[PDB]
Ligand binder design. Sequence first.
Ligand code: NAP
Ligand code: WDV
Length: 314
Amino acid sequence: QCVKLNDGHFMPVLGFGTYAPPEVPRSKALEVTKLAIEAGFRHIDSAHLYNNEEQVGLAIRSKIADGSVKREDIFYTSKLWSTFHRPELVRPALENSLKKAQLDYVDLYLIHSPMSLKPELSPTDENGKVIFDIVDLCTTWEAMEKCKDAGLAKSIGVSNFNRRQLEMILNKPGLKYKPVCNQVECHPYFNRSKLLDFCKSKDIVLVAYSALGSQRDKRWVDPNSPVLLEDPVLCALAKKHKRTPALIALRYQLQRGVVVLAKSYNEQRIRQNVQVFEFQLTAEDMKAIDGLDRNLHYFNSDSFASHPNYPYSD
Ligand SMILES: NC(=O)c1ccc[n+]([C@@H]2O[C@H](COP(=O)([O-])OP(=O)(O)OC[C@H]3O[C@@H](n4cnc5c(N)ncnc54)[C@H](OP(=O)(O)O)[C@@H]3O)[C@@H](O)[C@H]2O)c1
Ligand SMILES: O=[N+]([O-])c1ccc(O)c(CN2CCN(c3cccc(C(F)(F)F)c3)CC2)c1
């Protein structure tokens, strides 16, 4: 089922992850998203960065056209990339994203990250050092507010913000709309409980990404770090409930009132992940998973760690 946003709109509590790396043909994005919708998914998460909006838009419009689903049955998220943080660029980037997906509006538009870059998805100096930018994100937000006001996005939110960055938006002068959510890295090795409480107290949904340990992408993730789905507690619980570690991890998020994203480009696992609605972890199960937290984020950059808006300390 869904959950009510601080704006009145509803968000399905399970969402499909759509990112896949360059080497996965863009055609593939259209298939998987369709299987996702057929399987039961009603929340779809894309981004400009992901470069798959044409197919994801099509996927959706394809399932409206086969009578599977109405449009308001579907919750579609896109995201503003960091080269577009300047307010005069927010709306054009949203419009672009809509035009690509042949769609009238997105349910949710996010600030992908607070790490502003220079107005190239990854702009780079003479040496290959990525070029930072410093923008007042409150002006980015006022621009996001004009997009909601204009019906182009039903709900607005942020992604990758920490507590301090969220407070910055929440105490902006003349604030019109709270962010409805804050999409963040969240899984049992990095549960973000403190930030989860804060978000809750501000009537902000925490949406978990990489809740399955991520795609372990070579650009971002240290190959040393342990594979989430291989954890013995997550594996013990899978047997215990006759399910898979993935399913344990997803259901874990639901029972803390966290909306959870799951990515798969495999038809079996796409169908599997909706079994998350078929079973319950116990109170003991939950405290056991709570114990797994070890302050480990899969995404890393020595480059970005020195960006003035880097969200994690350390
Ligand atoms: N806001 C951001 O900055 C941000 C960052 C990262 C991600 N996201 C969102 O998060 C979404 C997903 O997160 P993620 O892409 O990092 O991946 P993820 O959800 O952690 O999943 C990672 C891997 O788990 C595997 N997997 C999925 N279901 C499984 C199952 N039932 N059993 C076993 N393995 C399974 C998948 O492989 P297969 O594909 O082989 O099934 C996938 O590669 C992304 O699509 C994106 O929408 C947002
Ligand atoms: O699978 N994927 O490769 C993949 C899939 C979906 C995505 O939205 C992205 C893009 N990410 C890049 C990392 N980023 C981030 C956020 C915080 C810290 C750090 C730091 F620790 F690295 F600095 C990085 C969030 C946005 C990559």
